[PDB]
From a paper:
In all living cells the signal recognition particle (SRP) recognizes nascent polypeptides destined for secretion or membrane insertion as they emerge from translating ribosomes. As SRP binds to signal sequences emerging from the ribosomes, the resulting complex composed of the SRP and the ribosome-nascent chain complex is then targeted towards the membrane through the GTP-dependent interaction with the membrane-associated SRP receptor (SR also named FtsY in bacteria). We describe the X-ray structures of SRP54 and SRP19 the two protein constituting the proteinaceous core of the SRP from the hyperthermophilic archaeon Pyrococcus furiosus. SRP54 and SRP19 constitute the conserved core in all archaeal and eukaryotic SRPs.
We solved two distinct crystal forms of Pfu-SRP19. Two molecules of SRP19 associate in a dimer with an extended β-sheet surface built around the anti-parallel association of their respective β2 strands. The tetramer is organized around two dimers facing each other through their respective β-sheets at an angle of 45°. Pfu-SRP19 is characterized by a more extended β-sheet due to longer β2 and β3 strands when compared with all other available SRP19 structures. The structure is also characterized by two loops (L1 and L2). The loop L1, the primary RNA-binding surface is rigid and well defined in density whereas the loop L2 is disordered and absent in our final models. Superposition of our free SRP19 structure on the RNA-bound SRP19 structures reveals that the difference between free SRP19 and the RNA-bound forms lies exclusively in the conformation of the L2 loop region. The disordered L2 region of the “free” protein has a well-defined conformation in the RNA bound structures. The structure of free Pfu-SRP19 reveals a compact entity and suggests that this subunit acts as a molecular scaffold and a chaperone involved in assembly of the functional ribonucleoprotein particle. Through an induced fit mechanism involving the rearrangement of its disordered L2 loop, SRP19 assists proper folding of the SRP RNA and therefore favors subsequent binding of SRP54.
Author numbering:
A (entry chain D): 2 to 56, 67 to 98
B (entry chain C): 2 to 57, 67 to 98
C (entry chain B): 2 to 58, 68 to 103
D (entry chain A): 2 to 58, 66 to 103
């Protein structure tokens, strides 16, 4: 359905307590808003909103619409970002 | 622990497909960012980030919170506090 | 005209080099986005967009407004309105 | 000095009433936040803050940049606009 993706949810540098949701092996180090959006589009998810504030440290959020629930979508996104990085 | 809260997650005007997470009876109608921040503060959750963009005003936003509880339980507690504020 | 207001433009805590536009005596300490919005509404300026980001540590943002005056005059009027708001609040109760 | 750049200030698609500061021929069509940042960096300005919000009505964009420049804002906006025009000509392969 529709949900928010917060980059920390996919960040392998973080504990679950600090925001990571995906298993650390699936997660990637310091995922960027730009990478998440790129993956979402490759995965044919609809991008509803992308907000980014850079102060440079980046703070951001993405709202997505997907054929699947958030958990599954986050994994597909993390895997896609890993692909991007392996090339 | 730490997690994001997107207002649509506790919006009773939305189906689960369109973003709602909490049970529709606990959900509240059109929760505002300010309402969520106020509830979090009353619940002694730590507010880490609050972003809001308002256009023409239609609002878009997110809150990052630190809670002793997981997101599901925290969203429910927040919804209840918002209901309480509104009732006054 | 339509123009952006950046809160630092009227912040007396800041030097001109760091972004303050209005004279220091008219500027106010740490103007909040919400106060600028309230001032604009009392001044009958139309608010087109309000963006704010608050980070735990604090506040960043911008307001797009329409005003019958140029930006420089409008900033001064907003600063003076906020000064009035804060004073009215202080004397209350 | 430090100041804000609001992309509409240099957007040739807009009238002055809707926010455009610089002359229309210097302004460029729909300058993107990222283009302004790229221009500022090329011009040796220092970028302090960049905010952008993109909403699906591809996406409608809203944003602002805080910059530091040796020049006043009016001249900096013109320099930025003309630099973006140059980048775009390069991307188009038209000099
Ligand atoms: Br774990
Ligand atoms: Br989380
Ligand atoms: Br993006
Ligand atoms: Br949204
Ligand atoms: Br964040
Ligand atoms: Br699923
Ligand atoms: Br996987
Ligand atoms: Br989260
Ligand atoms: Br954060
Ligand atoms: Br939103
Ligand atoms: Br929970
Ligand atoms: Br629960
Ligand atoms: Br409760
Ligand atoms: Br402006
Ligand atoms: Br303007
Ligand atoms: Br406001
Ligand atoms: Br706008
Ligand atoms: Br700022
Ligand atoms: Br005037
Ligand atoms: Br524009
Ligand atoms: Br505009
Ligand atoms: Br004009
Ligand atoms: Br005009
Ligand atoms: Br012209
Ligand atoms: Br022209
Ligand atoms: Br032009
Ligand atoms: Br152009
Ligand atoms: Br164009
Ligand atoms: Br950028
Ligand atoms: Br050089
Ligand atoms: Br800033
Ligand atoms: Br804007
Ligand atoms: Br400089
Ligand atoms: Br100059
Ligand atoms: Br100017
Ligand atoms: Br151009
Ligand atoms: Br061309
Ligand atoms: Br040519």
């Amino acid at each position: 359905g529709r949900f928010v993706v917060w980059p920390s949810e996919l960040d392998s540098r973080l504990s679950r307590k600090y925001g990571r949701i995906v298993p650390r092996s699936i997660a990637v180090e310091s995922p960027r808003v730009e990478e998440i959006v790129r993956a979402a589009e490759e995965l044919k998810f609809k991008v509803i909103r992308v907000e980014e504030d850079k102060l440079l440290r980046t703070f951001g959020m993405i709202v997505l619409e997907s054929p699947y629930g958030k958990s599954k979508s986050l994994k597909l996104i993390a895997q896609k970002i890993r692909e991007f990085r392996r090339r």
